[PDB]
Design a protein around this ligand. Structure first.
Ligand code: CLA
Ligand code: CLA
Ligand code: CLA
Ligand code: CLA
Ligand code: CLA
Ligand code: CLA
Ligand code: CLA
Ligand SMILES: CCCCCCCCCCCCCCCCCC(=O)OC[C@H](CO[C@@H]1O[C@H](CO)[C@H](O)[C@H](O)[C@H]1O)OC(=O)CCCCCCCCCCCCCCCCC
Ligand SMILES: CC(/C=C/C=C(C)/C=C/[C@@]12O[C@]1(C)C[C@@H](O)CC2(C)C)=C\C=C\C=C(C)\C=C\C=C(C)\C=C\[C@@]12O[C@]1(C)C[C@@H](O)CC2(C)C
Ligand SMILES: CC(=C/C=C/C(C)=C/C=C/C=C(C)/C=C/C=C(\C)C=C=C1C(C)(C)C[C@H](O)C[C@@]1(C)O)/C=C/[C@@]12O[C@]1(C)C[C@@H](O)CC2(C)C
Ligand SMILES: CC1=C[C@H](O)CC(C)(C)[C@H]1/C=C/C(C)=C/C=C/C(C)=C/C=C/C=C(C)/C=C/C=C(C)/C=C/C1=C(C)C[C@H](O)CC1(C)C
Lengths: 226, 230, 213
């Protein structure tokens, strides 16, 4: 648990280093209930893993093509060649049902741990689920677990938190200047005194609405000022 | 340890796997009362049987008469026996059978015997499950068929509302809507036809007129819940 | 130990936690007597019942408007159904007062005598108008689904949920009148006006709510 978030801070009582990435933190009291702390642990794992996917998508799609921009990459005009100008309703239907399966299976792993491990169609092999939020079994096709799980668990949480801050960076260094993360890094390395946080905060390059095949999306920045 | 509607869940205390089709699904607590659960079991059986007969009717009526449309099939049938003579015969012939079934529900050990052919009496059956003469040559296990009837019946209850909400949105019978979904799956869903965003709501247009003529006096056809649609 | 409307202040003595939706909100001590409180529980319930019916009425008939149907607004639906349908108006009012004077005086003499209204003096109904408790009549007519019997803890949950939805439907019905006396248009037109521009189309820019515009 040691080496806390600040040098002179006493850790809370419910943060004795059982969970990984535990730094005596929560200066807003949110983890003080245990049933709330397990759910907030699950949501930190969810935001961490989806944020790692977000970072490794945004800074790889401009590696493979630095023309399609990741902000408007959700527009049907910017989809690739076998999916260009697809009906987004059918795509949203695919995603809605295929995620309402998976997420409700994970949710019932939260609500009753151990009751959701079997393949329900093929009543055979289970998933060996050692602790909540870490199913494994078929989610470890390479078997990097069954070793020091605490070590890799701390590694996952630290890279995940860094990727959460990185992805909420990637959006805000794209709302202010309308430029991708490696492209904003190159814009900083061009002139590192007029292409910084100064004279870029205060403008919002996001348009107010974009017609996606008939729908207008409200499209807000996270600060005021266009 | 029976299978459930949601596998990790716990079924409610009033649902103990006794009845067929009991998969622990009653989240609103409607089957808590024991007296009311009998009425609800009877109405699930009757809704399910009418829905199975209706789904088979709409499908067979489409595969033998593709010209005429089942939502309009009560308008163009052109029977020789008049419009109201059909409704009078149906009224008396159904007000008989339904009061017989209702009196079976109220007092089960009351209504078995044929009143005009007194040598014929129905055997002491279970409520909702008459048998005897309604059921000749029953194949295999009666509890297994009693589960299969409720499963196919729940599927057909969902299928009839599927037929109605297809035929009010595309205006076509439920193979032609299936031919829409097989000719272009990505653009013939309900999420393709409709979406509501905070700032505008794109509902699908109606394919049912607000009235039909039908021999003088006109029948309003409410497009179910138009406006409340997505 | 129970949640209160104003944290910190203790709940008053006449208001221990046994009613549905109790949060200790009586600063004016109006229900200090047990029988006047017994009457105001009934009053809060039936105001909540009519306000839930009314709020669902306004919201459904305003989803009917603005989408394209022929429904009017809720402030215009009084005129359009006595003029589109040839309905003489004071007879509709007197039929409403007859039917609801019957249904209300039955309840008004259930409050004055709880075991009454059940002796078959009506058309042969004995247990159906028995009344389970204050503001929760039950029986075969007022609970045909039978949710007041079975699991009692879920019935207490439904009691508190009824009181919660009834409170915010009373607030909504107090708000529809203020949205109409301030703006002058439909409530779900006011919602889409607040959604098309979240700023500047709120109450503080209506010119009426704050006079210091
Ligand atoms: C939404 C993301 C999220 C969630 C749910 C959590 C949840 C948790 N974190 Mg965690 N964390 C996150 C992001 C998140 N973290 C990020 C991005 C960092 C890097 C700064 C950290 C760094 C961190 C440390 C160092 C530690 C934790 C710990 C904890 C646990 C106890 C604290 C608690 O109860 O908070 C519950 C949290 C919530 C209910 C979410 C509230 C969010 C508020 C409402 C909004 C945030 C304000 C603002 C918008 C943030 C700006 C971000 C932007 C500038 C990038 C809990 C499991 C402690 C732990 O592991 O103990 C076991 C611990 O020691 N976290
Ligand atoms: C660098 C980040 C990182 C790290 C260190 C881990 C580490 C871990 N994950 Mg995790 N995970 C991550 C990202 C990460 N994951 C992301 C982004 C997702 C979403 C797809 C997941 C989804 C996930 C699931 C669903 C499961 C794990 C599991 C595990 C554990 C064993 C597998 C393993 O060591 O693979 C580490 C692999 C690498 C470090 C390779 C990274 C290379 C890059 C391209 C270990 C705690 C399993 C577990 O705990 O089972 C008991 C488990 O069930 N994770
Ligand atoms: C923390 C104090 C603070 C506050 C409340 C504001 C508030 C504001 N700033 Mg601001 N700003 C600040 C510190 C602050 N600034 C600092 C430290 C820098 C450097 C800037 C640089 C900055 C720029 C470059 C711009 C603003 C603008 C704005 C306005 C719209 C956003 C708003 C009134 C924008 C505006 O409308 O002027 C704008 O263009 N600010
Ligand atoms: C109206 C027809 C109807 C009726 C009366 C019942 C009655 C019953 N069902 Mg059943 N069921 C139905 C249709 C019906 N079902 C359908 C269509 C499905 C498929 C989804 C199921 C699936 C199902 C399962 C999986 C289980 C039951 C069970 C039960 C029993 C206990 C639950 C209860 O109290 O229900 C009382 C219910 C009612 C009185 C219906 C109230 C209707 C309200 C007022 C409106 C509902 C609106 C609805 C959401 C609209 C859907 C629109 C569209 C999606 C179709 C009870 C005998 C359990 C059982 O068999 O245990 C014995 C059980 O495990 N049902
Ligand atoms: C596939 C659905 C299905 C299943 C499995 C059952 C099963 C059962 N029913 Mg049931 N029933 C159904 C549909 C079904 N029924 C429908 C739709 C109705 C309304 C007409 C009824 C009316 C009904 C009554 C009134 C009675 C039963 C009884 C029974 C039980 C014994 C009879 C038997 O062996 O049936 C076995 C059923 C089958 C093997 C299904 C064969 C289906 C064939 C292939 C024809 C289907 C297509 C056909 C063209 C449809 C048109 C026919 C008709 C509508 C004109 C058993 C539990 C009796 C009972 O409970 O006894 C105690 C009883 O008295 N049911
Ligand atoms: C107690 C609730 C209540 C409230 C707040 C209103 C409020 C209103 N009524 Mg209304 N009304 C009520 C009960 C109520 N009425 C009852 C019980 C009836 C008897 C059927 C009517 C019959 C009625 C008619 C016939 C008309 C109104 C009209 C109006 C509007 C006045 C202009 C106003 C919005 C008028 C209207 O629609 O606005 C022009 C109108 O013509 N009301
Ligand atoms: C959502 C609000 C709500 C809730 C949670 C309840 C809950 C309760 N009511 Mg109550 N009630 C309400 C609204 C509500 N009521 C309204 C608006 C009225 C006036 C019409 C009444 C009139 C009333 C009476 C007269 C009695 C009850 C009784 C009960 C209890 C048992 C019945 C039950 O569980 O209902 C469960 C409720 C639901 C599952 C929610 C309703 C389901 C759908 C979604 C509502 C949709 C509304 C629809 C759009 C418009 C329909 C209008 C209708 C007139 C046709 C329980 C405490 C009985 C009781 O306490 O017995 C002792 C009793 O005697 N209530
Ligand atoms: C001509 C128009 C006049 C009609 C008069 C109607 C009222 C007649 C009247 O007095 O009621 C006639 C009786 C009045 O009640 C009778 O009163 C008698 C002395 O007053 C005796 O006490 C009888 O026992 C009692 O039944 O009403 C009933 O009892 C009707 C009961 C019907 C029960 C149906 C249960 C429904 C449940 C099924 C739901 C599933
Ligand atoms: C999930 C997430 C992002 C996931 C993003 C994804 C999948 C992005 C996908 C895409 O980009 C690609 C790949 C390519 C694009 O073309 C398409 C899209 C679709 C756009 C970010 C979470 C980001 C989440 C973040 C940053 C959370 C930050 C929270 C903080 C810092 C709060 C801390 C505290 O609350 C605690 C924890 C405890 C309290 O006691 C103290 C305080 C301080 C209050
Ligand atoms: C988490 C997140 C998700 C965004 C999802 C979106 C936008 C989905 C759009 C999803 C768009 C979708 C589904 C579009 C669907 C279009 C469809 C169906 C097109 C169509 C139609 C209709 C409907 C007209 C109907 C007609 O008859 C047929 C047809 C074909 O013509 C975003 C978060 C943020 O945006 C905030 C909240 C704040 C920002 O500042 C920061 C970030 C973090 C970026
Ligand atoms: C009584 C008895 C007795 C004796 O003993 C013997 C005998 C005689 C044999 C018997 C009889 C019986 C019977 C009659 C039966 C019947 C049944 C049925 C009908 C079923 C159905 C059943 C049915 C069912 C399930 C159904 C299902 C359906 C479905 C899913 C559908 C779907 C769909 C839809 C939505 C729409 C779209 O667009 C398309 C589709 C895709 C098309």
């Amino acid at each position: 648990d040691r080496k806390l978030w600040a040098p002179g801070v006493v850790a809370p009582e419910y943060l004795k280093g059982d969970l990984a990435g535990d730094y005596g933190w929560d200066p807003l009291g949110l983890g003080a209930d245990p049933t709330a702390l397990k759910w907030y642990r699950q949501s930190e794992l969810q935001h961490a893993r989806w944020a790692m996917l977000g970072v490794a998508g945004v800074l790889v799609q401009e590696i493979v093509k630095p023309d399609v921009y990741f902000y408007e990459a959700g527009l049907p005009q910017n989809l690739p060649e076998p999916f260009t100008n697809i009906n987004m309703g059918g795509l949203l239907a695919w995603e809605f049902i295929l995620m309402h399966w998976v997420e409700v299976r994970r949710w019932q792993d939260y609500k009753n741990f151990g009751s959701v491990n079997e393949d329900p169609i093929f009543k055979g092999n289970k998933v060996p689920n050692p602790e909540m939020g870490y199913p494994g079994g078929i989610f470890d096709p390479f078997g990097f677990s069954k070793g020091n799980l605490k070590e890799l668990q701390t590694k996952e949480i630290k890279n995940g938190r860094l990727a959460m801050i990185a992805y909420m960076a990637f959006i805000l260094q794209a709302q202010a200047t309308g430029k991708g993360p490696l492209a904003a890094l190159s814009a900083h390395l061009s002139n590192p005194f007029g292409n910084n946080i100064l004279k870029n905060i205060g403008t919002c390059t996001v348009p107010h609405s974009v017609d996606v095949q008939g729908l207008t999306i409200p499209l807000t920045c996270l600060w005021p000022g266009s | 340890s029976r299978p459930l509607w949601l596998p990790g869940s716990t079924p409610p205390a009033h649902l103990k796997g006794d009845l067929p089709g009991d998969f622990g699904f009653d989240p609103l607590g409607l089957g808590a009362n024991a007296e009311s659960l009998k009425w609800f079991k009877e109405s699930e059986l009757v809704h399910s049987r009418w829905a199975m007969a209706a789904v088979a009717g709409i499908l067979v009526q489409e595969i033998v008469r593709p010209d005429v449309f089942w939502y309009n099939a009560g308008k163009e049938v052109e029977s020789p026996l008049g419009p109201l003579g059909l409704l009078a015969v149906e009224f008396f012939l159904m007000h008989w059978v339904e009061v017989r079934r209702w009196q079976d529900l109220r007092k089960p050990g009351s209504v078995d015997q044929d009143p005009i052919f007194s040598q014929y009496k129905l055997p002491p059956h279970e409520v909702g499950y008459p048998g005897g003469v309604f059921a000749p040559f029953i194949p295999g296990d009666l509890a297994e068929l009693k589960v299969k009837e409720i499963k196919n019946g729940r599927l057909a209850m969902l299928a009839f509302v599927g037929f109605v909400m297809a035929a009010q949105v595309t205006g076509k019978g439920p193979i032609a809507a299936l031919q829409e979904h097989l000719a272009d799956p990505w653009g013939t869903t309900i999420f393709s036809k409709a979406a509501v965003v905070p700032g505008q709501a794109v509902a699908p247009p109606c394919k049912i007129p607000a009235s039909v003529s039908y021999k003088g006096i006109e029948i309003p056809t409410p497009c179910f819940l138009q406006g409340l649609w997505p | 130990v129970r949640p209160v409307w104003f944290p910190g202040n203790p709940p008053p003595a006449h208001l221990d936690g046994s009613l549905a939706g109790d949060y200790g909100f009586d600063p004016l001590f109006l229900g200090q007597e047990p029988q006047t409180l017994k009457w105001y529980v009934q009053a809060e319930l039936v105001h909540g019942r009519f306000a839930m019916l009314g709020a669902a009425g306004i919201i459904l008939t305003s989803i009917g408007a603005k989408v394209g149907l022929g429904f009017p607004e809720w402030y215009d639906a009084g005129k359009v159904v006595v003029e589109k349908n040839n309905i003489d108006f004071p007879t509709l009012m007197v039929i409403q007062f007859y039917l609801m004077g019957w249904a209300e005086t039955k309840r008004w003499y259930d409050f004055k005598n709880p075991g009454s209204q059940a002796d078959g003096s009506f058309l042969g109904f004995t247990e159906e108008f028995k009344g389970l408790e204050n503001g929760y009549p039950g029986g075969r007519f007022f609970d045909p689904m039978g949710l007041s019997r079975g699991d009692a803890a879920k019935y207490q949950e439904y009691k508190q949920k009824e009181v919660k939805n009834g409170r915010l439907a009373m607030i909504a019905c107090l708000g529809f009148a203020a949205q109409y006396a301030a703006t002058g248009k439909g409530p779900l037109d006011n919602l889409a006006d607040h959604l098309a521009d979240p700023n500047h189309v709120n109450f503080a820019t209506n010119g009426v709510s704050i006079p210091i515009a």
